[PDB]
């Protein structure tokens, strides 16, 4: 019964502040391979791929089966839903997941306007 636990589920932040989003693979004998982050503006199912760089710092902790996104200098435009996606390491134990991914429940972020 594998799940990615994503925290925080919902958050309100002031502009110029920072947010860390954490995703952890729980209740699994599988390991993390590739990791990806997506943004959905309110409504849009169109996914904007957040690359490591600029205001986005993407880190992975393979031993803890966790990965995180840190956003700096938050804007009102950053408002919306953040999604994490991971693929599974190839191994005999998780062989039928070797082409599959798993996503977190998502983070809904509201950035309150400042000045």
């Amino acid at each position: 019964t594998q799940r990615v636990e994503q925290t925080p589920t919902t958050t309100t932040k002031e502009a110029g502040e920072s947010l860390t989003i954490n995703c952890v693979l729980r209740d699994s004998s599988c390991a993390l391979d590739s990791t990806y982050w997506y943004f959905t503006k309110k409504g849009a199912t169109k996914k904007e791929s957040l690359s490591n760089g600029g205001r986005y710092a993407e880190t992975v902790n393979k031993a803890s089966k966790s990965f995180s996104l840190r956003i700096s200098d938050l804007r009102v435009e950053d408002s919306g839903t953040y999604h994490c996606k991971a693929y599974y390491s190839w191994d005999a134990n998780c062989w039928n997941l070797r082409y599959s991914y798993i996503e977190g429940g998502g983070t809904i972020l509201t950035v309150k306007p400042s000045r």
């Binding site: 391979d33 590739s34 990806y36 791929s49 693929y87 070797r98 082409y99």
Partner: protein
Amino acid sequence: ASVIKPEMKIKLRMEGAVNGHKFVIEGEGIGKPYEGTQTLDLTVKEGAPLPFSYDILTPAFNRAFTKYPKDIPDYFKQAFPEGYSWERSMTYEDQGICIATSDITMEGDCFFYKIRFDGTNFPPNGPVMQKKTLKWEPSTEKMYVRDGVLKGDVNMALLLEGGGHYRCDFKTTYKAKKDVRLPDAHKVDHRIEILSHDKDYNKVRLYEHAEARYSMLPSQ
């Protein structure tokens, strides 16, 4: 009476572009169509040195080279002498995308391919443009009829330096130039490997082994 002999030679030309970089590669080889094995020697004619992983090209460089059992109609061998063509989409896990086509003909004991290959949106620091791929993992292609032609779908993955994988969704349409007996749904198991290369992959030796099989016993 079969025009497909136990040994057939191969001559091909690929023209393409990956992330804007143009190239031409020519090929000659030989294989055993009824044993599903083939070796190719490939040479870069324009665009050397290639700035991208050679492995993204290798499945573009002929299902005529497939060991088919007698109880599965062989779409590809029936297609000769006139021949067939395929069109393929390849969607990688990092939103890299390729499209490829091949027109396959025959003269005497030799197959002729004209291949077009186009790839785009490969991230500059991903495994394709940084050349971090090692090989394609063995695969199983699902073969099925739609719109009177043969479709192939296969989950593919490149092993990367460091033991990770780089996944791709392959979808192919195979179109014979004449009416043939269409098969029921079946699978093709593949292994592809670069046997040898020079430093910049200007010269590549490439081997494929493909065999067809049922996933379920025929209808009773």
